[PDB]
Design a protein around this ligand. Structure first.
Ligand code: PKD
Ligand code: PKD
Ligand code: NA
Ligand code: NA
Lengths: 329, 329
């Protein structure tokens, strides 16, 4: 029912956007079918955890505060696809960075602009008569701005914006917070509370604190899998060492490494050579970072498993969905 | 006074955006100064015709409908910088297309996202208590979506989105309309009417018709200068022939060219070779396209000089600014 309804609204959203282009933007059929294929390619195929989270929050709040149920459930599906389209927009922007008049790059940039604008068009249409339309766009635009700021922190974590000084645990948390946590964990929860009209009925401080901790828990495991999980099992090629990313493994190693090991780390980090990357993996393994990885995640999980209770003392139905979201993480 | 006030509000807008990053987004001073330089580099230096148009429309409507004058004039300056920042966003996106982990491309993409988001942040702040905040964002987002659709029409005018069939005058007008006319001419006028609270007091059909005709007049002259004005006088290197653009010269030539000249045109168009481009210029010159250029622009100017009168019979102060805008074109 949740996944099935989420896909039916996708067809409804896609049909409106494409017909709007045909009826109001003078678009020819060839380009409409071209944009249908691009939308399906970029927006479909993932796990839809961000979009389904908006649905799961909405169904938990209508059970504990007829005609309003079906409306809120439909509004949550549109908000779910706003985040999915936003995620597709971020992924397209990432492809342009590593892929390199070249018409394929021109279309890639155009795709990224259309996916972002489509979040506005589908919101301005299906929420035209909603009282929360203005507040929804402001929180959506602010979180999107937050993500772009977090991408600046992540991209420039190894240089001086006109370098391992910013390779600290507090700065790692800043990167995870702005680049990932706000739009992946906090935004689906907020949009689920907005369509359920129960936004001022929750402790936002505890909610934000959980979103950052869940994103932190997810990112620490992600950095670890990027380094040791093989490509055919991870689904991609791990490249954090070659890209000199400010990963959890790097900032944790630098805190417990000897003075001579840091020299060996700095001399091998950020290189595409197969053995310098293997040297970094060897340093991570010998420093017993795997033992700290289990302890760090357990402590974060303890903070998560205990922070949901503060949220249920004032909003019980909200906490049920955060546990399901944490169960996915 | 207009240009001087427009620059004072820029300092006010820039100071808010940068302090917000410092105070609310945990940004370090090094990146704040980095973003100050990027903002100045991308948003300053142009002619500010889009931004000043919002000011000129606002001052003409407060003279023919104390505390409300200074507020509307300030609101028009913020709306003027929204379009300038939006224009800077489009230009950055254009640089990424022709410029080619590469950190300079990562920062270019990040710059384009920040410039766009900054239009939302400066609007959500200075217009927080304005009743038109929701309507302003919707018309702004829709025009931005329109521009991205027009860029699709322009980029794919020579191929079949998975070719000279689309090299027609009606499709040329569609490209100019969506890619340029809506955000360069219509949007500054609409935003000037919104801050002056006189949006429903104008004939939008005549206003839209003037924006398309003025953008058409501007683009026809632009395509002509791109082909024959030398680089040191044009300010850039004309590349429409090499890029196989759907320019006014191309669609006009194909209508009055002989069957054998079209073969010579198709065999030389869209090539970087110095003589194939000179062959295209020779074909444009021999076809007497310069004589049609003066006649076409005169006819458009006649349509412009006569359409402003329909607008003044119902909105006299609005027509005074459209003439000043047309005087710039
Ligand atoms: O996430 C996991 O449980 C699995 C996924 S693959 C890596 N991994 C580890 O626990 C790990 C192995 C070596 C080091 Cl040095 C640190 C962590
Ligand atoms: O815009 C202009 O007046 C100037 C700017 S440079 C070109 N130009 C022309 O009038 C022109 C010259 C040759 C052809 Cl075939 C067509 C037009
Ligand atoms: Na998702
Ligand atoms: Na301008």
């Amino acid at each position: 029912m949740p996944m099935q309804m989420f896909m039916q609204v996708y067809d409804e959203i896609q049909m409106f956007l494409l017909e709007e282009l045909e009826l109001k933007f003078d678009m020819d059929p060839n380009r409409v079918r071209y944009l249908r294929k691009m939308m399906d390619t970029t927006c479909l195929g993932g796990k839809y955890n961000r979009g389904l989270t908006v649905i799961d929050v909405a169904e938990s709040l209508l059970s504990l505060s007829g005609a309003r149920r079906k409306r809120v459930l439909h509004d949550a599906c549109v908000c779910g696809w706003m985040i999915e389209f936003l995620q597709a927009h971020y992924l397209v922007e990432d492809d342009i960075m590593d892929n390199s008049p070249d018409v394929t790059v021109q279309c890639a940039i155009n795709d990224g602009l259309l996916l972002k604008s489509w979040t506005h068009m589908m919101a301005m249409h299906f929420f035209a008569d909603r009282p929360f339309l203005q507040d929804l766009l402001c929180r959506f635009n602010r979180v999107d701005y937050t993500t772009a700021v977090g991408q600046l922190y992540d991209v420039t974590s190894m240089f001086d914006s006109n370098d391992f000084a910013e390779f600290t645990l507090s700065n790692y948390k800043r990167i995870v917070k702005y680049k990932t946590a706000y739009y992946t964990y906090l935004l689906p929860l907020v949009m689920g509370l907005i369509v359920s009209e129960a936004l001022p009925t929750v402790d936002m401080g505890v909610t934000e604190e959980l979103a950052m901790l869940m994103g932190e828990y997810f990112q620490v495991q992600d950095d670890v899998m990027d380094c040791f999980t093989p490509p055919e099992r991870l689904g991609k090629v791990g490249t954090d060492i070659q890209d000199a990313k400010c990963s959890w493994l790097a900032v944790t190693f630098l805190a417990k490494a000897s003075s001579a090991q840091v020299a060996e780390f700095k001399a091998n980090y950020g290189s595409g050579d197969s053995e310098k990357v293997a040297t970094v993996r060897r340093l991570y393994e010998e420093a017993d970072l795997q033992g700290d990885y289990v302890a760090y995640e357990a402590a974060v999980a303890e903070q998560v498993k205990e922070l949901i209770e503060k949220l249920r003392l004032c909003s019980p139905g909200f906490a049920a969905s955060v546990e399901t979201l944490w169960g996915k993480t």
